[PDB]
Short mmCIF file of C-alpha atoms and ligand atoms in Angstrom, two decimals:
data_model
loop_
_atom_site.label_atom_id
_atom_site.label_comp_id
_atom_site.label_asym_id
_atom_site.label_seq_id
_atom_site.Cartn_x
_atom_site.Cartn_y
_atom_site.Cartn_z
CA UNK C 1 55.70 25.10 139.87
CA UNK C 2 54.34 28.43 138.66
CA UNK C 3 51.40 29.74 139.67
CA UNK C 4 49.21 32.14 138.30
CA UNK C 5 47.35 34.39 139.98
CA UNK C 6 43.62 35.22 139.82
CA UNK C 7 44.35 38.70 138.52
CA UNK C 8 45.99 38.20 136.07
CA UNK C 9 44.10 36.27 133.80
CA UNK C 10 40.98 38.56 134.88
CA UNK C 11 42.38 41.69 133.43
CA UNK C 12 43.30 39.78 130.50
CA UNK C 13 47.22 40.36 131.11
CA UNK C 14 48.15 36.89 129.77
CA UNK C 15 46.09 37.13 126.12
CA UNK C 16 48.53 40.49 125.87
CA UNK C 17 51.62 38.48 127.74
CA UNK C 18 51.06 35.62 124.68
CA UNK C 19 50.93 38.46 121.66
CA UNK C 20 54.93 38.84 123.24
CA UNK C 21 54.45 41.93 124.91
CA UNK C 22 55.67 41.90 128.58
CA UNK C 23 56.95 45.15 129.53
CA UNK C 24 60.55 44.96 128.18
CA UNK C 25 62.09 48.19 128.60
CA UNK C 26 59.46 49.81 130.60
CA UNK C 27 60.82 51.76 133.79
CA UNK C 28 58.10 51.12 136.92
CA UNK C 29 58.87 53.05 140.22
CA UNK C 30 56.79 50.94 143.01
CA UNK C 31 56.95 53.86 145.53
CA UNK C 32 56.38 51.81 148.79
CA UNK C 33 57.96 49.73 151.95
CA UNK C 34 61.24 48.92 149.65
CA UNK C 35 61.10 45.48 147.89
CA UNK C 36 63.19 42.43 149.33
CA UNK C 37 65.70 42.28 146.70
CA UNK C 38 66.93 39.07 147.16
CA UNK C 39 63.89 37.52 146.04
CA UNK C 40 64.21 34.84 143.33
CA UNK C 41 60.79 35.72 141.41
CA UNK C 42 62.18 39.52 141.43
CA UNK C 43 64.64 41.56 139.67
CA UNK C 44 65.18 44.85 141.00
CA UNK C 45 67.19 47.20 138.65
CA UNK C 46 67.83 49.99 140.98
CA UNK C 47 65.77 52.65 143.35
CA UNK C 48 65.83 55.14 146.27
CA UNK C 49 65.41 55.25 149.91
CA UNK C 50 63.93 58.12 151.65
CA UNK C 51 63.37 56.95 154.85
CA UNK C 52 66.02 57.29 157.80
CA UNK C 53 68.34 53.85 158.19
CA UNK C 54 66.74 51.41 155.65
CA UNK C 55 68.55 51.11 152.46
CA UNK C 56 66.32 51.02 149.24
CA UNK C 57 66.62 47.02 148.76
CA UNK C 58 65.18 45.20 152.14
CA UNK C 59 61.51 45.42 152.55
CA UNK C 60 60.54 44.93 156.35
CA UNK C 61 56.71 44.93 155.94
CA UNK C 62 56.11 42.68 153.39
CA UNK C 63 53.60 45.53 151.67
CA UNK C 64 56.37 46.54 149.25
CA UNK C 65 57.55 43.53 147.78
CA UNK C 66 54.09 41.86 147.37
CA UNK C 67 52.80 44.97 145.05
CA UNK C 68 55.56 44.83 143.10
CA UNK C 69 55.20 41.53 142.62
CA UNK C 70 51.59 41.93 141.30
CA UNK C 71 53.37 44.30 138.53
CA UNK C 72 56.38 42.16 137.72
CA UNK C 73 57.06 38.68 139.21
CA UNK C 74 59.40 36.79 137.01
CA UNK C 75 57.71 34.90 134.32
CA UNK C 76 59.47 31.49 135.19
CA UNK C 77 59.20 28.50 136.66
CA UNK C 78 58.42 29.45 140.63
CA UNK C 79 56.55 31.70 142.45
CA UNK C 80 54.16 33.30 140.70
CA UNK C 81 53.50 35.73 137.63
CA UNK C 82 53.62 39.39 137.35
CA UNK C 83 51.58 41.67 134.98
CA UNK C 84 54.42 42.46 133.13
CA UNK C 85 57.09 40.28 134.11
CA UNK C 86 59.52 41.71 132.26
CA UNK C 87 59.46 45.43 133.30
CA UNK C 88 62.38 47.29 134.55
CA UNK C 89 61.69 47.87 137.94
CA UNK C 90 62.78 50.03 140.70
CA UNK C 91 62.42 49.77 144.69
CA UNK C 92 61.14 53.66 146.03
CA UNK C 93 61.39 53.50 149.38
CA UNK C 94 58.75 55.77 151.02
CA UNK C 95 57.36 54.09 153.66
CA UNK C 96 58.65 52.81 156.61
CA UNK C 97 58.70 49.22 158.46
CA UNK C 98 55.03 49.97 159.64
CA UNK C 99 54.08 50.55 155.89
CA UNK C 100 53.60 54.75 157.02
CA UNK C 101 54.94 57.46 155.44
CA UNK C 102 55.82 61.37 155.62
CA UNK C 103 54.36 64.09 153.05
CA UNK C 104 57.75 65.36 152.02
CA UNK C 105 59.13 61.73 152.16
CA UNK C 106 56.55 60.44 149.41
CA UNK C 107 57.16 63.86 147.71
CA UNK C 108 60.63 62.91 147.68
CA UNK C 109 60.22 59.63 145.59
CA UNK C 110 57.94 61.25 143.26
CA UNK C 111 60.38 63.72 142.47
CA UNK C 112 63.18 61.24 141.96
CA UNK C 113 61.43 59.19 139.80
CA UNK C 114 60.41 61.85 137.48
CA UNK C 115 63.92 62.40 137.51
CA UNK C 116 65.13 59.12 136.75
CA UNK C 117 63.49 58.73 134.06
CA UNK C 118 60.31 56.30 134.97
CA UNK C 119 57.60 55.57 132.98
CA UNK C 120 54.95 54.47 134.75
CA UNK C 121 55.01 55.28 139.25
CA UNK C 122 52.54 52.91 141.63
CA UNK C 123 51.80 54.88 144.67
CA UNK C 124 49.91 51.67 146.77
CA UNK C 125 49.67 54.58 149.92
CA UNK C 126 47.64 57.22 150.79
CA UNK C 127 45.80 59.18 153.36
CA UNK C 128 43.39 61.80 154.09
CA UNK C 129 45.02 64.93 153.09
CA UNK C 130 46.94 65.77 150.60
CA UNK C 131 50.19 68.40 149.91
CA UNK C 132 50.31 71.12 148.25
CA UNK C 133 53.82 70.03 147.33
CA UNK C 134 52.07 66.87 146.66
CA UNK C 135 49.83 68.16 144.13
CA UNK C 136 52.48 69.34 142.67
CA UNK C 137 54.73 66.50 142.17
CA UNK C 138 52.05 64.42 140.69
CA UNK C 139 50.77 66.93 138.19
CA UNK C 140 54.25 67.21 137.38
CA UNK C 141 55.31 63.54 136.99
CA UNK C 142 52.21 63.60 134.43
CA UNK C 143 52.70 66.92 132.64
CA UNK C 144 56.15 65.11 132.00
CA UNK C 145 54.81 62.11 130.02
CA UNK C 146 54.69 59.58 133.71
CA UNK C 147 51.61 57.36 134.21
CA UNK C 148 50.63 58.38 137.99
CA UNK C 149 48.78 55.37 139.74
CA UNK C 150 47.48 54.91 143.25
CA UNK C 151 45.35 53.03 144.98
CA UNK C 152 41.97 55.05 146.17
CA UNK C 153 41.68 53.92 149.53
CA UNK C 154 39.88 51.08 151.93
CA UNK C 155 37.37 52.96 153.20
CA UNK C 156 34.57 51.26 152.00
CA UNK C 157 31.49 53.44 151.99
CA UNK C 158 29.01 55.72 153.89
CA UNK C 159 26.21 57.14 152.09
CA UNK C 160 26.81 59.46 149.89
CA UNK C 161 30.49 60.54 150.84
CA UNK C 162 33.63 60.35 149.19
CA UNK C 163 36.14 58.07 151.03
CA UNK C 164 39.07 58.60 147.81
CA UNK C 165 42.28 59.05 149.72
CA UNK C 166 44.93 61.02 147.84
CA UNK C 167 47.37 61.44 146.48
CA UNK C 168 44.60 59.09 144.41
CA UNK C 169 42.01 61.67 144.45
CA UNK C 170 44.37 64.40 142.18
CA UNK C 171 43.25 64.60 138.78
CA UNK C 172 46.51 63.82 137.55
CA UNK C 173 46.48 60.64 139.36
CA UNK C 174 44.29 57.12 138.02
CA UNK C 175 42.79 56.00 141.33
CA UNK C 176 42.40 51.97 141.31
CA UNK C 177 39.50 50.59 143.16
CA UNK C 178 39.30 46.43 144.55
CA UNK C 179 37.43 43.20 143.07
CA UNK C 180 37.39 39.92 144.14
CA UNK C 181 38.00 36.95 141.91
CA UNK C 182 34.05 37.00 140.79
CA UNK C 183 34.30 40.36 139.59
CA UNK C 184 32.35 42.22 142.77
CA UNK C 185 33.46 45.48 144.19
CA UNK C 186 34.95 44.36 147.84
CA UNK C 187 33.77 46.09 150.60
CA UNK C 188 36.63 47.82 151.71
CA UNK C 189 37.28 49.47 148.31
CA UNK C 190 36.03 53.44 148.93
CA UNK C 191 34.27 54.89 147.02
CA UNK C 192 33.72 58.79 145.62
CA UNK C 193 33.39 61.16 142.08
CA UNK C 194 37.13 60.15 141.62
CA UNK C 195 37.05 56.78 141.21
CA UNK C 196 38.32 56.20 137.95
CA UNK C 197 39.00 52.04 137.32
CA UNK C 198 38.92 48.75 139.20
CA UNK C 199 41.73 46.02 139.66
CA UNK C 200 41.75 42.44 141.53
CA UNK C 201 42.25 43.38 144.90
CA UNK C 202 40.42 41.59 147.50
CA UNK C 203 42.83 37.31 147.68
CA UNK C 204 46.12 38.75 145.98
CA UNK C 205 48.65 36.48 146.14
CA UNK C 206 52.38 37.55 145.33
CA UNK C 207 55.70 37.74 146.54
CA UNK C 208 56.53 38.43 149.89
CA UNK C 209 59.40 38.45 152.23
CA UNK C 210 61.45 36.49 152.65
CA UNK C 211 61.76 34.36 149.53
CA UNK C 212 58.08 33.11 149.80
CA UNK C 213 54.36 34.01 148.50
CA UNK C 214 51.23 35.46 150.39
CA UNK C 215 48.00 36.54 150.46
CA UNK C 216 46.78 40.41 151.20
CA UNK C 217 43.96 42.44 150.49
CA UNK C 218 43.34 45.74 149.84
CA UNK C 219 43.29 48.90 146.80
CA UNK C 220 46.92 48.44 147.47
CA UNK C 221 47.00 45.41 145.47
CA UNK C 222 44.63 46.59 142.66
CA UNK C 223 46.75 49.34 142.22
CA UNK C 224 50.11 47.86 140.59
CA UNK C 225 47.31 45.64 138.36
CA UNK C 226 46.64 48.48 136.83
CA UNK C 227 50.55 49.90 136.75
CA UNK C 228 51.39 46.73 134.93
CA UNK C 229 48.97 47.21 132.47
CA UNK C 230 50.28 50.61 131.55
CA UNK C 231 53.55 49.13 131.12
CA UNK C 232 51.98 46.49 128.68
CA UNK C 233 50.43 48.93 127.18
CA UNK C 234 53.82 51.36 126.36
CA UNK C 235 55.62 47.93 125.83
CA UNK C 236 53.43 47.53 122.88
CA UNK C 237 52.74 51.15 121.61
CA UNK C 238 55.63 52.53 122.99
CA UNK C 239 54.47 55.85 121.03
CA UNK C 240 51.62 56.65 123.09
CA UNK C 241 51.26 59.34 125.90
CA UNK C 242 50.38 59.38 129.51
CA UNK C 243 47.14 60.27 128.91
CA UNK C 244 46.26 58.15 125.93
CA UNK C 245 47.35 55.48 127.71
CA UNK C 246 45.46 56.32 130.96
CA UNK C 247 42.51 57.22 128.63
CA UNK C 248 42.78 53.43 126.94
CA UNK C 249 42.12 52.31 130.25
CA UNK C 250 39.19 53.97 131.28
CA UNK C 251 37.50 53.95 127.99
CA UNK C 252 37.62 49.80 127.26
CA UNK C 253 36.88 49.01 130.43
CA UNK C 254 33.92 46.23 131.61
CA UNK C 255 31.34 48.15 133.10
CA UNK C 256 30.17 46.90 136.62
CA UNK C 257 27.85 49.54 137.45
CA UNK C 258 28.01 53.26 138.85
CA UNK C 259 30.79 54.85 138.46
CA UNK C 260 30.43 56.01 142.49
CA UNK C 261 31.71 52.55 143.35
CA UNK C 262 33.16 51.45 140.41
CA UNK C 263 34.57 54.46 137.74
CA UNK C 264 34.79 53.34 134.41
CA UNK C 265 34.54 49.25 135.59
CA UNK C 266 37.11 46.32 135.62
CA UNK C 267 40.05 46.89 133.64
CA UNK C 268 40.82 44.69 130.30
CA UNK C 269 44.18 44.79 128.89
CA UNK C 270 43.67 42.87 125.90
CA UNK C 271 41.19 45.71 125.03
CA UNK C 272 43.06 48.69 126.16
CA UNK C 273 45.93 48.14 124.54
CA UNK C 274 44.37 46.91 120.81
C1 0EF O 1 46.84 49.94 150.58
O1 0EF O 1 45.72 49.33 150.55
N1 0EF O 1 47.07 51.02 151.40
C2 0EF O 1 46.08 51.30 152.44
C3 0EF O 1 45.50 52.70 152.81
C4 0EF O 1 45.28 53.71 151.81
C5 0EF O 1 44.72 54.91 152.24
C6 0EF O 1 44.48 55.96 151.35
C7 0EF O 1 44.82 55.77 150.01
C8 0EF O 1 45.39 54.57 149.60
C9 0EF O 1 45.61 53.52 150.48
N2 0EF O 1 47.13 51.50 153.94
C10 0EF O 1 47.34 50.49 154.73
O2 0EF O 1 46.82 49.39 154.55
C11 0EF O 1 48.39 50.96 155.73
C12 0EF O 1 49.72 50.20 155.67
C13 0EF O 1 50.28 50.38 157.10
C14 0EF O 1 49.15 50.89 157.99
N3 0EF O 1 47.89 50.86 157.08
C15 0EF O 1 46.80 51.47 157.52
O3 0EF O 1 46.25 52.43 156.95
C16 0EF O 1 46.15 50.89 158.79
C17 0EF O 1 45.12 49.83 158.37
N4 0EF O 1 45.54 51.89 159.68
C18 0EF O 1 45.85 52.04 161.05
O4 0EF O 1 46.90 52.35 161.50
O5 0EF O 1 44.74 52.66 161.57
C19 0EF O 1 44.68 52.40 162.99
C20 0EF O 1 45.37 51.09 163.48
C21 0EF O 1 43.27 52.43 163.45
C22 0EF O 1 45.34 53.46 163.80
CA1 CA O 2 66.12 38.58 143.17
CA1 CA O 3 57.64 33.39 138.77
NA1 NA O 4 41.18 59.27 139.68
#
């Protein structure tokens, strides 16, 4: 009745899941659509709304609930299997029903969840510009000891330009490219100098509304791979910084080939966190 996927046996999440370190006690802001509460493979500890008449726990996309699922689906007997299943997690709503999203809204939920107190944020959003209030509120949530991840974009590629959406492209921000099950860069991952690691992203199947599973593609689902791994990380070397921990994944990571299209290569859990 479980099932388990792809992802998270290709990052190595379940030789780190079997040492018995899960994510217990790590705080994860999924900064999205909302998450559908309700769900039986989730457990939603608390969160924000920021967008007008939608209340923090009701996801109306889908996009939400099936990222955070990729970080923490209930290790049980149903569904399917997060990263680190046992992660505190919290539903940031900063996007609305058609999965868009307003500058100072996404602001917003970065602020609150350096607030709050969260260790590791998942932005699975972006666009082609940036804030300067933006900038800020990610080199803040990082200055502060918060492990800033978002997914780079689906772009794809176009000679030699740089298709990195941000808030991924800020330094003080890991941006996640996609890989299929065999390991290949997809074709809609972008590409550009900022690239910094690769996730499972193209045949992601997780929770979705309401109360059942799906399939979706996109950086937006390699993203919260790599979240989860930063909360196995911390749930195992609780000690470490932001940066040592981002640094862990970059530096043990498979190489694929240049780091244009691929940064640093395919993450590896069991590796990074050692
Ligand atoms: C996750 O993969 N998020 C991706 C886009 C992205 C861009 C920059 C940095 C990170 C991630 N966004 C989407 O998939 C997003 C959700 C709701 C709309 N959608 C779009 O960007 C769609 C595909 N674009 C669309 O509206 O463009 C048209 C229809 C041409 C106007
Ligand atoms: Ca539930
Ligand atoms: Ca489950
Ligand atoms: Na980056």
């Amino acid at each position: 009745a479980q099932t388990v996927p792809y992802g998270i046996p290709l990052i190595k999440a379940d030789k780190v899941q079997a040492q018995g370190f899960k994510g217990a006690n790590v705080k994860v802001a999924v900064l999205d659509t909302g998450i559908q509460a309700s769900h039986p493979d989730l457990n939603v500890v608390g969160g924000a709304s920021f967008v007008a008449g939608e209340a923090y726990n009701t996801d109306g996309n889908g996009h939400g609930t099936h990222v955070a699922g990729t970080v923490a689906a209930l290790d049980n007997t149903t569904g399917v299997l997060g990263v680190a299943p046992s992660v505190s997690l919290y539903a940031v709503k900063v996007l609305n029903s058609s999965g868009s999203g307003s500058y100072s809204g996404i602001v917003s939920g970065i602020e609150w969840a350096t607030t709050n107190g969260m260790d590791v944020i998942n932005m699975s959003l972006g666009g082609a510009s940036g804030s300067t209030a933006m900038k800020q509120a990610v080199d803040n949530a990082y200055a502060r000891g918060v492990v800033v991840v978002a997914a780079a974009g689906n772009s794809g590629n176009s000679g030699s330009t740089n298709t990195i959406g941000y808030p991924a492209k800020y330094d003080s921000v890991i941006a996640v490219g996609a890989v299929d099950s065999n390991s290949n860069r997809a074709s809609f991952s972008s590409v550009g100098a900022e690239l910094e690691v690769m996730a499972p992203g193209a045949g992601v199947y997780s929770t979705y509304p309401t109360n059942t599973y799906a399939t979706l593609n996109g950086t937006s689902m390699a993203s919260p791979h790599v979240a989860g791994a930063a909360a196995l990380i911390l749930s195992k070397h609780p000690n470490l910084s932001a940066s040592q921990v981002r640094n862990r994944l970059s530096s043990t990571a498979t190489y694929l080939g240049s780091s244009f299209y691929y940064g640093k290569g395919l993450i590896n859990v069991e590796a990074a966190a050692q």
